[PDB]
Amino acid sequence: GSSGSSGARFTEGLRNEEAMEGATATLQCELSKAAPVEWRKGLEALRDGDKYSLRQDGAVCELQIHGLAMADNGVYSCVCGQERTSATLTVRALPARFIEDSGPSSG
């Protein structure tokens, strides 16, 4: 056994985010010092695979959510260890295609 306690504080904290529906949300947050964190949506244990992309450089954390939708909307929480920060994701619905006349965008 060796003294290896871990504990970091969100010196930056998560900020409001905005993205379109179906897009790939991307959150950003920093910690008082390099340390492992954990993201949990709607009180759920998120994992790294295809739907979610977990990646960070040193301390700067960054979460990505592939496949945005109305359901996604809500509040995401990030528990680093000592404290936990939450944010709000605004997902905008995509428009529909209707009768129109347009071709070349060069004019």
The answer to whether position 99 is within a domain reads: no
Give the number of other Cβ atoms within 10 Å of residue 19's Cβ: 17
- Structural domain including 77 reads 7-94
Amino acid occupying residue 103 = G
CATH number where 49 lies: 2.60.40.10
The count of C-alpha atoms lying within 13 angstroms of the C-alpha of 59, restricted to the half-sphere facing its C-beta, is: 12
Give the number of other Cβ atoms within 10 Å of residue 58's Cβ: 10
Do the beta carbons of residue 82 and residue 13 sit within 8 Å? Answer: no
The answer to whether position 1 is within a domain reads: no
User: For the chain, what is the domain count?
Assistant: 1
Method of structure determination: NMR
Number of H helices, E strands in the chain: 0, 8
